[PDB]
Design an enzyme around this catalytic site. Structure first.
Site, PDB file in Angstrom:
ATOM      1  N   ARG C 116       0.884  -1.454  -0.035  1.00  0.00           N
ATOM      2  CA  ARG C 116       0.114   0.023  -0.332  1.00  0.00           C
ATOM      3  C   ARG C 116       0.789   1.220   0.052  1.00  0.00           C
ATOM      4  O   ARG C 116       0.300   2.240  -0.076  1.00  0.00           O
ATOM      5  CB  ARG C 116      -1.039   0.043   1.292  1.00  0.00           C
ATOM      6  CG  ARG C 116      -0.394   0.646   2.479  1.00  0.00           C
ATOM      7  CD  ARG C 116      -1.119   0.353   3.546  1.00  0.00           C
ATOM      8  NE  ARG C 116      -1.176  -1.152   3.995  1.00  0.00           N
ATOM      9  CZ  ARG C 116      -0.034  -1.865   4.841  1.00  0.00           C
ATOM     10  NH1 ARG C 116       0.889  -1.118   5.463  1.00  0.00           N
ATOM     11  NH2 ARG C 116      -0.166  -3.013   4.889  1.00  0.00           N
ATOM     12  N   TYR C 117       1.987   1.269   0.160  1.00  0.00           N
ATOM     13  CA  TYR C 117       2.999   2.418   0.205  1.00  0.00           C
ATOM     14  C   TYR C 117       3.529   2.767  -1.159  1.00  0.00           C
ATOM     15  O   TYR C 117       4.084   4.000  -1.388  1.00  0.00           O
ATOM     16  CB  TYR C 117       4.532   2.375   1.110  1.00  0.00           C
ATOM     17  CG  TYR C 117       4.236   1.432   2.500  1.00  0.00           C
ATOM     18  CD1 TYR C 117       2.902   2.009   3.080  1.00  0.00           C
ATOM     19  CD2 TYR C 117       5.039   0.751   3.068  1.00  0.00           C
ATOM     20  CE1 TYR C 117       2.554   1.598   4.398  1.00  0.00           C
ATOM     21  CE2 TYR C 117       4.718   0.249   4.381  1.00  0.00           C
ATOM     22  CZ  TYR C 117       3.681   0.480   4.813  1.00  0.00           C
ATOM     23  OH  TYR C 117       3.274   0.302   6.407  1.00  0.00           O
ATOM     24  N   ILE C 118       2.882   2.198  -2.196  1.00  0.00           N
ATOM     25  CA  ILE C 118       3.384   2.560  -3.483  1.00  0.00           C
ATOM     26  C   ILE C 118       2.014   3.071  -4.444  1.00  0.00           C
ATOM     27  O   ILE C 118       1.009   2.871  -3.875  1.00  0.00           O
ATOM     28  CB  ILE C 118       4.130   1.368  -4.445  1.00  0.00           C
ATOM     29  CG1 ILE C 118       5.199   0.578  -3.081  1.00  0.00           C
ATOM     30  CG2 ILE C 118       4.964   2.041  -5.738  1.00  0.00           C
ATOM     31  CD1 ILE C 118       4.505  -0.559  -2.830  1.00  0.00           C
TER      32      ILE C 118
ATOM     33  N   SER D 168       7.036   5.192  -0.136  1.00  0.00           N
ATOM     34  CA  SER D 168       6.364   6.326  -0.920  1.00  0.00           C
ATOM     35  C   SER D 168       7.462   7.264  -1.661  1.00  0.00           C
ATOM     36  O   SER D 168       7.034   7.601  -2.691  1.00  0.00           O
ATOM     37  CB  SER D 168       5.262   6.917  -0.226  1.00  0.00           C
ATOM     38  OG  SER D 168       4.121   6.374  -0.105  1.00  0.00           O
TER      39      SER D 168
END
Lengths: 200, 442, 442, 200
Positions: C116-118, D168
């Site tokens: 979920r971090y990308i 991220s």
């Protein structure tokens, strides 16, 4: 004295009773709300069960679910087909791969230890409609994909509903299926060992 | 390499604070205004989003309760999947907020079917009791895409029941009948003496009474022979398996009775035949206590009314009357907001319709020529008219069939209708509107 | 109670057939026309669906590869989640079919970041090479919402490489340079002598060359001192950890060399200094062979070109030339389809524009009056005109500014354009259109 | 001897050297792509590490990761930090709850077992940005949600991008965060054995 059973009043008594080896207690609740009060019985399974052959007869008796089912039907391992608490046994499972590809072959392998049972044909299966077409007020009950494809050419209001799994049926659908079923029966070829020897 | 540095280990509170956030925004206490739970908020929001125009479409439960992660749900999808079946059924709710198609279980067997063999949709029971969805205040945090609490007409906390156990608090809001809650809200609108709503369990035909004020529930036993009876019902918190195994099977193991399973389509049917080794006393009052003691036909209970209010604070209410009063007080203001916004929108709509009618009658009269205006000179001259300049673009987007008498006289009459409807919205009050909304629910 | 009793054992094929379906529609062999894999089909379909108008929006990878269940994926979401990072990166593809924003790893460490971090989106590299998406034949099964295979301009099987191991078959399609494949397709359009496309690994500056038939890959070693060199590159199938642990750490454990980790931003930088306990022979050819053997600077490989064609059949091709020829043969027909449909649509569009211009010029001329016609009388006569009757509903949906000369004259000219545009589609051929599409890709 | 380490040439020397106790193989690989060639080191963690308080020192030596870090920094359990392979140590994790709630307490408790090293202040943590704001063509690095809320009043083209974890950030972002980093000490007050009373 088993506990999961839905033992009817005609257990042991001679009648035209049937045993439902269905999968999922959710389905058996629908059965309680739909069952015949005296004839139709039933029993819920646990799910994925070990292959019937590959080990000994006492090791058939080792498994808990197999023990419960032989206690329920009264057909104890190692005897002739007698003292049948239920006159008939039926199998009904979620029809994508949960019971057709996992439960049906194993259950037939277990029931194969009594060729007399298959000779009587007392082991049967209730075919659930794969697809339901909702037309007008009264819906139709196409029983297979091939029938759907060969009979969809001329039909208005082609509202389609997939019945993948026993949970998709409503109370009316399950009532119709139980009260007016099709009752496909189990195989009996010239040899009763090689065709399930393909299992391994 | 800019090194700012303080020896403040008290920043470890950010753990507890975060844990506080993990024990505040993810609690189990319902919300008093909307009657939901944190999981049900996301579940219903996703169901509403998926339903769209074709609300009759049956969405899979997996799609309904598995795609709630992006809506701002910081928990596993299993909670949403399981909470989508304990709320969308009919055996556990007097007001099903989500209709379903499949095996959702019943009071006989309290178990859902699966994750993907069932379907769900926003029921018709939700649109008649949850009006003004778009006026719910947005959550403080952005990731909470669904609003803080929807706005219903009658408090859903009371209905459908709820049983949650948080840290140091427990809520066991008993379900109430729809008619009782509707009457209580309607009569509390006008400030009369509030009548306490009754208790009506779903699919229950037995008895519920408050002799001690504890709201106890008892079933019905019906003797059919000298040594047989027909149990028609048992207390609510009982399915077939747990009832049998916990109480009735040990009773048979004591060599006292034998039970014939007669669980019909209408509730339980556990008929029982005694044997010699039992009392079977006479006088119709000792056997009375024995028959409702041995078979567990008597259930004690209590009401722990604790719930979160409009803000983040949690309050405990001694009786449901205060909850009804506060909920209706909040909904009064939330209806006044809709009244004001409706007036504001209807005034502009009427003005636009009046300008449209003026343009159409001037064009059919020929005072202003649609053709022959270079460089769409129309807009330029309309920008210097008293009422035209406000809607010039909308005043130019006029279809050909809008010039004929069919779409001109009816357009003028529609403008007049918008005027009188604006007057109606102007003159109406909150009490009358809320009374109409209350009556609309049935 | 219908009997339907057959003691037939043939129903056991329902196992194999179903297992066949589990080993046919869920294989690992790519598809020759579109160059995808079964999981990548659903991944890209969901990405295209989520992109919609705002294709630049960065969707979460969890949303991208977890919502593929309803698209017709009969497998766990983990396969989609992992296949969304091994195709969307840049270190493993000469043609990234999915751009990303985050830590997708590199050749140094071949591992994605998380679930979920990308973020991911349909890259601009997909719209210039996958035209005519809506003409892909629909799958035989209904649940397969994504089509059987998209229609690209150059075969994506060749590019980005692929390595699959099915039951009894293995595919190791080596990546090819974009320029080589484009030139091969362009020249094979006109039926010249096909030039074999070259091999260009992503982020590779070393050497690739075939020894005899099969391809091999070798790195570059650069000497800097009598007992030191600066390894610039190593064979492709090597990340830092596995390379070290498997070849270089055992080399140091033998008391031979010591490595200084100098893995710069531009590839590997494993500089090494020898010690006394090694050969370090002269003559510049035995030392070179010993270096390329001990240090693992030589990698042998082979091309196993097996792939599913446009139908369900699986075909094995000896050389990529046949694959190029067959792919271009299929794409020729799939372009002819677009040509025919474009002609059909453009003729109707031109006719509609001509009728629109006729109506506006008659209205401004005043021959037919739009006003004074009760019961919208216009349509009734428009239904009995040579060309009006076909588009009456559209012919009456004319805005006011459409009567203005500004939107009138140009409209006629626009109609004229459509007319000549029709001729452009009428006289053009498949070869010219496909050549233009091929040039458009860069 | 050590395997996962990123030992630099300046390791064990008198020059400044920082150790990155990052989480996830992706983050350490990204560091490799962005590391300083001589100064900055690094080492990746495994994840959930057992609480380091309340057992024998041999129990600290039991865990594999603790043994690896003990060998890497050279500060052996029960000894002092008189000599160290790395001058500095930095801790950085995915900052939603994966390292703040899990890596932080255990790692801080383990590293606190040498109050002298604590007083030196060599152990530090690099603050990772929580939201990045794209304004025009440039970017801004709001370091906390409070800063975002107090600074969002006056800025055009509010393009918000959350940073939940180390995955991220992009190469420009990680390059800025490494070559131009901001640190914070581990902050232990005079009460060594009291502020971590919630660890067990």
């Amino acid at each position: 004295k088993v506990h999961k059973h839905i033992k009817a009043n005609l257990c042991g008594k001679d009648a035209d009773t049937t045993l439902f080896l269905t999968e999922g207690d959710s389905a058996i609740g629908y059965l309680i709300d739909v069952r015949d009060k005296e004839l139709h019985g039933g029993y819920p399974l646990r799910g994925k069960v070990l292959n019937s052959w590959g080990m000994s007869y006492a090791d058939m008796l080792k498994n808990k679910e197999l023990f419960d089912i032989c206690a329920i039907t009264g057909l104890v391992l190692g005897e002739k087909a007698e003292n049948l608490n239920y006159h008939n046994i039926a199998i009904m499972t979620d029809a994508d791969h949960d019971g057709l590809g996992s439960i049906y072959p194993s259950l037939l392998g277990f029931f194969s230890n009594w060729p007399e049972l298959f000779e009587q044909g007392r082991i049967r299966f209730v075919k659930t409609p794969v697809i339901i077409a909702h037309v007008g007020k009264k819906q139709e009950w196409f029983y297979t994909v091939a029938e759907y494809e060969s009979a969809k050419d001329a039909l208005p209001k082609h509202s389609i509903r997939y019945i993948k799994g026993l949970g998709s049926l409503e109370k009316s659908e399950y009532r119709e299926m139980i009260q007016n079923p099709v009752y496909d029966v189990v195989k009996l070829p010239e040899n009763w060992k090689e065709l399930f020897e393909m299992l391994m | 390499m800019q090194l700012n540095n303080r020896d403040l280990k008290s920043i470890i509170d950010n753990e507890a604070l975060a844990y506080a956030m993990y024990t505040v925004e993810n609690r189990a206490i319902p919300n008093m205004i909307d009657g939901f739970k944190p999981v049900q908020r996301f579940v219903i929001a996703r169901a509403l989003d998926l339903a769209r125009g074709n609300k009759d479409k049956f969405h899979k439960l997996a799609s309904i309760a598995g795609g709630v992660a992006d809506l701002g749900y910081h928990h596993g999808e299993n909670s949403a999947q399981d909470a989508g079946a304990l709320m969308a059924n009919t055996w556990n709710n007097n007001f099903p907020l989500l209709d379903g198609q499949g095996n959702f279980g019943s009071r006989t067997v309290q178990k859902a079917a699966a994750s993907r063999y069932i379907f769900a949709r926003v029921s018709k029971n939700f649109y008649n009791v949850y009006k003004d969805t778009e006026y719910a205040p947005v959550h403080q945090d952005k990731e909470h895409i669904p609003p803080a609490f929807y706005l219903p007409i009658i408090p859903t906390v009371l209905l459908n029941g709820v049983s949650g156990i948080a840290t140091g608090y427990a809520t066991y809001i008993l379900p109430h009948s729809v008619s009782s809650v509707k009457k209580a809200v309607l009569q509390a609108l006008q400030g009369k003496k509030v009548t306490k709503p009754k208790v009506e369990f779903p699919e229950f035909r037995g008895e519920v009474v408050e002799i001690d004020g504890q709201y106890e529930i008892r079933g019905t036993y019906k003797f059919t022979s000298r040594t047989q009876m027909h149990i028609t019902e048992i207390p609510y918190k009982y399915d077939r398996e747990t009832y049998v195994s916990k109480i009735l099977d040990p009773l048979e193991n004591k060599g006292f009775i034998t039970w014939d399973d007669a669980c019909g389509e209408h509730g339980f049917g556990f008929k029982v035949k005694f044997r010699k080794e039992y009392s079977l006393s006479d006088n119709e009052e000792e056997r009375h206590a024995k028959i409702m003691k041995d078979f567990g036909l008597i259930e004690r209970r209590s009401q722990n009314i604790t719930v979160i209010n409009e803000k983040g604070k949690l309050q405990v209410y001694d009786n449901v009357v205060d909850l009804i009063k506060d909920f209706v007080e909040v909904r009064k203001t939330y209806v006044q907001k809709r009244i004001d916004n409706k007036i504001k929108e209807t005034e502009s709509a009427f003005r636009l319709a009046f300008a449209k009618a003026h343009f159409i009658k001037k064009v059919i009269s020929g005072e202003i020529v649609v053709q022959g205006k270079t460089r769409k000179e129309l807009t330029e001259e309309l920008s210097k008219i008293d009422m035209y300049s406000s809607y010039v673009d909308k005043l130019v987007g006029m279809n050909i069939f809008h010039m004929t008498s069919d779409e001109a006289k009816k357009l003028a009459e529609e403008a007049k209708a918008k005027k009188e409807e604006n007057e109606y919205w102007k003159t109406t009050d909150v009490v009358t509107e809320y009374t109409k909304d209350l009556e609309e629910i049935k």
